[PDB]
Write a protein that binds this ligand. Structure first.
Ligand SMILES: CCOc1cc2c(cc1OCC)[C@H](c1ccc(Cl)cc1)N(c1ccc(C)cc1OCc1nnn[nH]1)C(=O)C2
Ligand SMILES: CCOc1cc2c(cc1OCC)[C@H](c1ccc(Cl)cc1)N(c1ccc(C)cc1OCc1nnn[nH]1)C(=O)C2
Length: 84
């Protein structure tokens, strides 16, 4: 139920995929990031689970060049780095 306030860069990213809010549940953040990954085609066509964000704003925000979507605890850390 927790509402979080994204830092400026993550907030702009969320707004790029149609987010209209100031604060978000972690669920909404994950949905919007998933939409971002889909729209920017940061997932690989052939390779399961891996998101390639090295060329992308997302990579700048997360501080990694790639990650697996299976690693939920790591994903939470990467997002929380970008929350107030
Ligand atoms: C209540 C809503 O919850 C979630 C929604 C979404 C995800 C995880 C969630 O919750 C778990 C933390 C993840 C995802 C992973 C990491 C981030 Cl940086 C962003 C989004 N995703 C997603 C993105 C890419 C790929 C290849 C599979 C995905 O998703 C199936 C998948 N996820 N894990 N295995 N398969 C979404 O499109 C939305
Ligand atoms: C109550 C919160 O729980 C946890 C949170 C986190 C982790 C483990 C947890 O609990 C298990 C010990 C682990 C991690 C591993 C060891 C330590 Cl020395 C520090 C952090 N991690 C994490 C860090 C780096 C990498 C490359 C992957 C990670 O994570 C994979 C991963 N594991 N599960 N999903 N993704 C986190 O970013 C947060």
């Amino acid at each position: 139920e927790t509402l979080v306030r994204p830092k400026p860069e993550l907030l702009k990213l969320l707004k790029s995929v149609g987010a209209q809010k100031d604060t978000y549940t972690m669920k909404e953040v994950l949905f919007y990031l998933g939409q971002y990954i889909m729209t920017k085609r940061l997932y690989d066509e052939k390779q399961q689970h891996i998101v390639y964000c090295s060329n992308d704003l997302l990579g700048d925000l997360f501080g990694v060049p790639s990650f697996s979507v299976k690693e939920h605890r790591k994903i939470y850390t990467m997002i929380y780095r970008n929350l107030v």
